Design a protein around this ligand. Structure first.
Ligand SMILES: O=c1[nH]cnc2c1ncn2[C@@H]1O[C@H](COP(=O)(O)O)[C@@H](O)[C@H]1O
Length: 358
C-alpha cells in the first residue's frame, strides 16, 4: 500500500508491533483488537473473518470467545446473589431437587463457580450428551478432593453454577442472558445463540488444518463457553467492569465478580475473572495461565487482599480470545482471533501492549 496515508491513531504503532508478528507466526486468518485508554475505545482489525466471503474483520465481527463466556456466566450468578435468589454458600442441591442425596448436598454454589468442588474434570465425559445423561453424571460423581481444597478448572463445574443460578431466577439460562444480563451491560451485539439477522457478522474459526469450523453443541455449552461477541461489545463489558452500569443490581453483581476467593501462585480466583497484583511480571501472568494451572489440580491458598489486573482466556477448536484490564489505570485490551493459537502468545502480546498504555 505504498503512497496511502497511514492511519492517524497514535496507538496503532504499539498495537501493530505486538499483533502483526503474532498473525504471521501462528498463521491467524483474522483478529479484532480493541483497546481502552483515557476513557476512549480504539479498534484495530486484521485479516479476514470468513475466507469464503473474503470479508475483513471489524469491531462488529462476531467471534466465539470460548471460556471468556465464564465471566458473563459468573456475572449472571452474581446477579442472582444480588437479587436474593441465592447465596454463594448455599449447597448446590438447594437449587436442584434432582441433586438431593448426592455429594452436591455438601458442595456450595461458590465452590462450583470457582472450580473447587473437589475434582470435577475439565470436560464432561464424551458419553454425557443429553440433559438426562447429565443429571445421571452428577448424581454418580465421586469427589476426589474435599470441597474448597483444590482448583481443577472445569466446564461441568462452572456450567452447573450457571445452570442452577438461572434456575434460582426461574428462567432458562440463554433467555436470561440475552434478555436481561447482556442488555444491562450494554452488549447489544452479544449472543448465546446468534440470530438470523446477525449470522452474516459471525466469523468462521479455522483449525490447524485450516478447515472452517464453529463450536459444537455440548452439555452446558451456553454456560461454559458458548458466547459469541464482537471486540466492541467485549470492550463495553470491560468498561462496565471499570466505571459500572446504570442497572443497580447489575452494578453490585459486577463488583461481586471481582472479589477474591483463593489464590494459586500469583493468581487469585474471583467469580469468572482471575486477578493479579498490578503491575504484574510477564512470568507471573504466564504462570497463572499455564498448562499446570489450566489442566491439573492445584491446592487453594489464601486470596490476595482486596491496583489489580483482571483477565480471562477463552478458546474453542477454531477461536482464541483474551481480555485483560486494569481498573485503577483505566486501561484494557480485548483480542479476538479465529484461530486457537497458544495462550502464551496472547499473554506476551497483551502484556506488552498494556505496559505501553500505562
Ligand atoms: O479438553 C481439553 N483437554 C486439553 N486441553 C483443553 C481442553 N479444553 C480446552 N483446552 C485448552 O485449555 C486452554 C484453556 O482454555 P480456555 O480457558 O478456554 O482458554 C486452551 O489452550 C484450550 O485449548
Amino acid at each position: 500500500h505504498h503512497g496511502e496515508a497511514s492511519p492517524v491513531d497514535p496507538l496503532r504503532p504499539v498495537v501493530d508491533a505486538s499483533i502483526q508478528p503474532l498473525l504471521k507466526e501462528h498463521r491467524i486468518p483474522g483478529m479484532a483488537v480493541a483497546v481502552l485508554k483515557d476513557g476512549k475505545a480504539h479498534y484495530f482489525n486484521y485479516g479476514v473473518a470468513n475466507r469464503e466471503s473474503g470479508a475483513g474483520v471489524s469491531e462488529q465481527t462476531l467471534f466465539e470467545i470460548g471460556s471468556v463466556s465464564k465471566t458473563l456466566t459468573a456475572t449472571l450468578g452474581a446477579y442472582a446473589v444480588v437479587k436474593g435468589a441465592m447465596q454463594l454458600d448455599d449447597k448446590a442441591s438447594r437449587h436442584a431437587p434432582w441433586l438431593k442425596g448426592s455429594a452436591f448436598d455438601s458442595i456450595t454454589m461458590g465452590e462450583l463457580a470457582t472450580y473447587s468442588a473437589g475434582g470435577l474434570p475439565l470436560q464432561f465425559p464424551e458419553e454425557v450428551d443429553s440433559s438426562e445423561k447429565m443429571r445421571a453424571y452428577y448424581r454418580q460423581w465421586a469427589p476426589v478432593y474435599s470441597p474448597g481444597s483444590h482448583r481443577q478448572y472445569s466446564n461441568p463445574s462452572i456450567g452447573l453454577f450457571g445452570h442452577l443460578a438461572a434456575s434460582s431466577l426461574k428462567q432458562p439460562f440463554a433467555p436470561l442472558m440475552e434478555q436481561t444480563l447482556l442488555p444491562g451491560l450494554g452488549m447489544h451485539h452479544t449472543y448465546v445463540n446468534v440470530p438470523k439477522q446477525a449470522m452474516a457478522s459471525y466469523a468462521y474459526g479455522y483449525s490447524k488444518e485450516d478447515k472452517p469450523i464453529r463450536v459444537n453443541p455440548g452439555m452446558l455449552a451456553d454456560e461454559a463457553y458458548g458466547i459469541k461477541t464482537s471486540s466492541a461489545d467485549l470492550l463495553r463489558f470491560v468498561k462496565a467492569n471499570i466505571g459500572g452500569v446504570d442497572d443497580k443490581a447489575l452494578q453490585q453483581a459486577i463488583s461481586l465478580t471481582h472479589q477474591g476467593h483463593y489464590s494459586v501462585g500469583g493468581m487469585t480466583q474471583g467469580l469468572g475473572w482471575e486477578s493479579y497484583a498490578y503491575p504484574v511480571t510477564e512470568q507471573t501472568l504466564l504462570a497463572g495461565n499455564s498448562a499446570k494451572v489450566i489442566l491439573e489440580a492445584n491446592p487453594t491458598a489464601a486470596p490476595r487482599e482486596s491496583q489489580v489486573l483482571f483477565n480471562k482466556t477463552g478458546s474453542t477448536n477454531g477461536f482464541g480470545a483474551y481480555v485483560a484490564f486494569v481498573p485503577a489505570r483505566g486501561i484494557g485490551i480485548v483480542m479476538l482471533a479465529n484461530r486457537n493459537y497458544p495462550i502464551e502468545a496472547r499473554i506476551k502480546a497483551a502484556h506488552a501492549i498494556l505496559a505501553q498504555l500505562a
